[PDB]
Amino acid sequence: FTIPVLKISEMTNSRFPVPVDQMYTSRSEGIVVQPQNGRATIDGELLGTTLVSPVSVCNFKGNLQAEVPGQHQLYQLQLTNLDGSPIDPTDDTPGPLGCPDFTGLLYGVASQRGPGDATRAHEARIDTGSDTFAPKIGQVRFYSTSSDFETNQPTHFTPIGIYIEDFNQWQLPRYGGHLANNNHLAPAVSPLFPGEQILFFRSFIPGASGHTNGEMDCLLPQEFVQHFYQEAATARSEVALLRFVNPDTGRALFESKLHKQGFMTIASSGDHPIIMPTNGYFRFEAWVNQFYSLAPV
Amino acid sequence: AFTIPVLKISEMTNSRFPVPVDQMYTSRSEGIVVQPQNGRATIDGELLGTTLVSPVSVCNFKGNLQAEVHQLYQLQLTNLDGSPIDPTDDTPGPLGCPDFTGLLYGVASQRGPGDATRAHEARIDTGSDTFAPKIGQVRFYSTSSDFETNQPTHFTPIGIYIESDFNQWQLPRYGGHLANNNHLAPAVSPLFPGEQILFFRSFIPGASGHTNGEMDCLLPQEFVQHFYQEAATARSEVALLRFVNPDTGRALFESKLHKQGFMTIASSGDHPIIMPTNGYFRFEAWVNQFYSLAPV
């Protein structure tokens, strides 16, 4: 079994198409950690709405069906899957792969190519928390400060950041609209062993407006998802022991438990970033059980 | 031991622009020098040009909003990973720097003071005289004046703006109009008769005007990452590959993966290489540059 050699700064966030900024740990007090993107067993089984492509999460693609009545510069998208295939509500997923897994005002740019090679693009916002947001059945709407959009022309939404007018990275959206309950969701995760906390790979996504640190925590960097999908090595135990080492010194910095279901934990207490030498990276050490005792920090 | 990751064309990421690969494509490249700087990696694991491993960083910019030169701003670039720009590096420019000339359309965002944020459309003319990323000098025009001076700023790429036109094979002057490029990954071309380079093409978004946004890269970003990661020794100058249909069982065609980091096939003319969706490349054997490939 193996994990690719990568510095924190070479990692890609698996919940938003941007690099990882830092490792971070938390008590996650009063919160259910149940992301749907960046979900993969160390076995190579992708969960939730997780796809392998690292530049597709939070992107949308589909036909510009029409403009909603009354509301201006608010457009209705008829989604296809990001790879072009038609949206299939019968799939055993909460929603289309790469679909945002948080509630908030997603800021981005909607572009079109057509008729012919004619193109146009403008800022756009999609409220993943709005009642009408129903990507599971292909119904998604975006607001734009421009009316320069063609009806029935291929359209794509490129994500950028969050717009604050609120952004809740742990609040799952209703993939099927206000009249449907989510299903097929990757399970929530949490540390079960005393003194441990989940280790997150955090990024500060861009803010388009208002106040926000745009904190976005994912359980595994996208590269680990791709590697597990690719290797499909058998999990010899429920926990793969990793050890963060500093190639510069030869010094190892701390150990972490990579759980079979796809998340890491460390022996730590409180909400704080895990600051380490820039060239540090994780390496597989051995197979242990969930009772393995880790030294703090 | 050499290997290439199992991937469908639709699972591949373009190495010159942060978007998925749309299709394989081949060309005579008539009257054109193929010398991209991004997506450059020897099958040995040696990264060339301005190539980085991160798949979401190419064509992005980061730095301080130094000042206004009307709604034209001067950036004081840092490397994408935060480290200061170092012109002494043996690279043409900072890693991930665009390797084409044109009007790059995107969005410039800021966070600061405190957790205050703001973002607006922005354009960077990688062909403009002032464009000098090798020394950290880059400017962006925005239809908004809502930008803070001396606040961390980031440029997220999106597409091309057509008004100076997009030329995917014209390298920008990384050091500004008063300096010549250097440390450039070498140009590549097919040397064997009847062969042409096999490109991994994507249609990047158009922000305005007419354009198919064709962007051809020599290797999908995943192969760059894999070679960087494996660093397996090249037993010969050419790694023979086969594109197989897992559905059926048999080969569709063969391609030669050159040690320097580019592929060629036996083909003639400019056209897309259309194959069954589940098809993917696999390493077959080590051959020399004289290996004869069957057409198509």
Author numbering:
A (entry chain B): 227 to 391, 396 to 527
B (entry chain A): 226 to 294, 298 to 391, 395 to 527
Publication passage describing the model:
Norovirus capsid displays an icosahedral symmetry that is composed of 180 copies of a single major structural protein, the capsid protein (VP1), which organize into 90 dimers. Each VP1 can be divided into two major domains, the N-terminal shell (S) and the C-terminal protruding (P) domains, linked by a short hinge. The P domain is further divided into P1 and P2 subdomains, forming the leg and the head of the protruding P dimer, respectively. Expression of the S domain alone formed smooth, thin-layer S particles without the protruding structures, while production of P domain in vitro resulted in P dimer, P particle, and small P particle. Functional analyses showed that the P dimer and the P particle, but not the S particle, bind to histo-blood group antigens (HBGAs), the host susceptible factors of noroviruses (see below), indicating that the P domain is the HBGA binding domain.
The P domain of VA207 (amino acid 222 to 537) was expressed in E. coli and the HBGA binding profile of the resulting P protein was verified (data not shown) before being used in the crystallography study. The crystal of the native P protein of VA207 belongs to space group of P21212 and contains a homodimer of P protein in an asymmetric unit. Most residues from 226 to 527 could be modeled in the electron density map, while residues 295 to 297 and 392 to 394 could not be modeled due to lack of interpretable electron density map in these loop regions. P2 subdomain, spanning from residue 275 to 415, is an insertion into P1 subdomain, splitting the latter into two fragments (222 to 274 and 416 to 537). While P1 forms the legs, P2 constitutes the head of the P dimer with a β-barrel made of 6 antiparallel β strands folded as a Greek key topology. The P dimer has a dimension of 56 by 66 by 70 Å and contains a large buried surface area of 3, 300 Å2 (for two protomers) formed by both polar and non-polar residues. Both subdomains contributed to the dimer interface: the α helices in the P1 subdomain interacts with each other by hydrogen bonds and hydrophobic interaction, while strands β5 and β9 from the β barrel in P2 subdomain was bound mainly by hydrogen bonds. Similar to the protomers, the general structure of VA207 P dimer is very similar to that of VA387, particularly in the P1 subdomain region. However, significant differences were observed in the four loops on the P2 subdomain connecting β2-β3, β4-β5, β6-β7 and β7-β8, as a result of sequence variations in the four loops between the two strains.
